[PDB]
Design a protein around this ligand. Structure first.
Ligand SMILES: CN1CC[C@@H](Oc2cccc(F)c2)C1=O
Ligand SMILES: CN1CC[C@@H](Oc2cccc(F)c2)C1=O
Ligand SMILES: [Zn+2]
Length: 140
């Protein structure tokens, strides 16, 4: 689990989004596993505006933050699934690291702020859904 809170926005994994997330839908992308919902309480997170390829992510399944090198956001085919069709995901960044399904929503951050959230895992890779291209997350 886990979310980003910037301004009056909540960013979550689309597969983990609640009834309340969908009641207050701002934006979703099924190909990116991202959903943004509206919040009443102002969030204090800063979104990274950069092309860092290094940072730290939280891994709930190890209760540990790991420093990682990661790929630039790309279209990638993700093997295995759940209740979803083991398929393509856009704006996805891979690193070598530990990721289980419940690690989704773990934040990846550089010195500039929030880069993305854990979205995929397996084979000793962790996938992160990039949010840095969503410039509208920092205004009204
Ligand atoms: C996982 N999902 C998908 C829809 C969402 O709940 C809803 C359903 C209808 C109206 C609404 F405002 C929200 C939910 O729980
Ligand atoms: C659509 N979904 C839901 C979670 C993801 O599966 C995983 C599998 C392993 C690690 C991980 F972090 C995520 C997926 O394919
Ligand atoms: Zn950065």
């Amino acid at each position: 689990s886990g979310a980003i809170y910037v301004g009056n926005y909540r960013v979550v994994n689309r597969h983990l989004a609640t009834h309340n997330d969908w009641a207050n839908l701002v934006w979703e992308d099924s190909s990116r596993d991202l959903l943004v919902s509206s919040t009443t309480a102002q969030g204090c997170d800063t979104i990274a505006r950069c092309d860092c390829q290094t940072g730290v992510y939280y891994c709930s399944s190890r209760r540990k933050h790991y420093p990682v090198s990661f790929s630039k956001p790309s279209l990638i085919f993700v093997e295995a699934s759940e209740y979803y069709p083991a398929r393509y995901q856009s704006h996805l960044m891979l690193a070598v690291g530990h990721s289980e399904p419940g690690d989704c929503g773990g934040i990846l951050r550089c010195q500039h702020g929030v880069v993305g959230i854990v979205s995929t895992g397996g084979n000793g890779l962790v996938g992160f859904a990039d949010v840095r291209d969503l410039l509208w997350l920092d205004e009204e």
